[PDB]
Amino acid sequence: AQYEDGKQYTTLEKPVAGAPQVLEFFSFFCPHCYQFEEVLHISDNVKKKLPEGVKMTKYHVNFMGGDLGKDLTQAWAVAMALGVEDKVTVPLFEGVQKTQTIRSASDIRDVFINAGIKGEEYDAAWNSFVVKSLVAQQEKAAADVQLRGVPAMFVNGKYQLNPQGMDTSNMDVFVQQYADTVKYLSEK
Numbered sequence: 001a002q003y004e005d006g007k008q009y010t011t012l013e014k015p016v017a018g019a020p021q022v023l024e025f026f027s028f029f030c031p032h033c034y035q036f037e038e039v040l041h042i043s044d045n046v047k048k049k050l051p052e053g054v055k056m057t058k059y060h061v062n063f064m065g066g067d068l069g070k071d072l073t074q075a076w077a078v079a080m081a082l083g084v085e086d087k088v089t090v091p092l093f094e095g096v097q098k099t100q101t102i103r104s105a106s107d108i109r110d111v112f113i114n115a116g117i118k119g120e121e122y123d124a125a126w127n128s129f130v131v132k133s134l135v136a137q138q139e140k141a142a143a144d145v146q147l148r149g150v151p152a153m154f155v156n157g158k159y160q161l162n163p164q165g166m167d168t169s170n171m172d173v174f175v176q177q178y179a180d181t182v183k184y185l186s187e188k
Helices: 031-039 042-047 066-082 085-098 105-114 119-126 129-144 171-187
Strands: 009-011 022-026 056-060 152-155 159-161
Touching: 022 031, 022 042, 022 129, 031 042, 031 085, 042 056, 042 171, 056 066, 056 129, 066 085, 066 105, 066 119, 066 129, 085 105, 105 119, 119 129, 152 171, 159 171
Parallel strands: 022 056
Antiparallel strands: 009 159, 022 152, 152 159
């Protein structure tokens, strides 16, 4: 067919019941994740084409960047809890990969402060059990699919996107093929 199992996507041999509808994993240390988010805008373009009612989840992972990697998973939890993902995603990516000015948990906190989150509110969230349960959700979801690389996208805990089987000569055309493929998988 046009969309072949084992070509533009693969099927999980062990489907994950109760998984989010569209689930993306990334790391702020991940160079291809920087491309996906900062240059290609994959998440946003997948969104604009998802059928009505289908929600998108994006989680950070621990297996890159050591201690600071784990701090970023907790920071991403804070972002989700405060609903400020769209305010901190760019300066966190640029802080880790462009300026290389993020070297500690305090440097991460500075990004939120600069983005207008009050220090007391960031600190309260950072230490909150609501944030600890969000960190757990991120770890569990990665574990549910035995995740060992990013970027990665899963649909209905059944299907994993396979972008390596795609032409990347034109960035726009690649992004829309990626998005149209998620839409297809969503309708399966």
